[PDB]
Design a protein around this ligand. Sequence first.
Ligand SMILES: [Cl-]
Ligand SMILES: [Cl-]
Ligand SMILES: [K+]
Length: 164
Amino acid sequence: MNIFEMLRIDEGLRLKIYKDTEGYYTIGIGHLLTKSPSLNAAKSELDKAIGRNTNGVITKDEAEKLFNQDVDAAVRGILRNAKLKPIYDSLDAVRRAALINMVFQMGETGVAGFTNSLRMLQQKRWDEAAVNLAKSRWYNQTPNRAKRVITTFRTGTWDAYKNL
Ligand SMILES: [Cl-]
Ligand SMILES: [Cl-]
Ligand SMILES: [K+]
């Protein structure tokens, strides 16, 4: 297991524009296109992102290319953020993937807002961090995914993803 495999499980793979859990146009492996309710806007983006006039469908290789970029951008965002960098630096590699996962799903700004959870993580109070992380809109809206990510932070193992 690794961050790519982890996120592939959590986000799935769809080759045509679809709506994510929040109702937002997305494609490939969780690549958010826009928060706009306009499909045309989403199609625009798709074309910009892939570099060609697509008509809302992409190939698997194209989906994987956006995913590679997206994982890299999440790591990049954590590293540039004053609130997240120290947390990321303090973690082991399995927990680092859990944080990248959160940032991919909600964005740098979003995760940096998790102040208290972040502090418990940096303190390495795993059980407490896990309880705290669950007290969130994130957990309530995507509880199965959240539980997976939280278990990863709690244990430092991939047990939540094995068998998937
Ligand atoms: Cl993009
Ligand atoms: Cl879920
Ligand atoms: K998805």
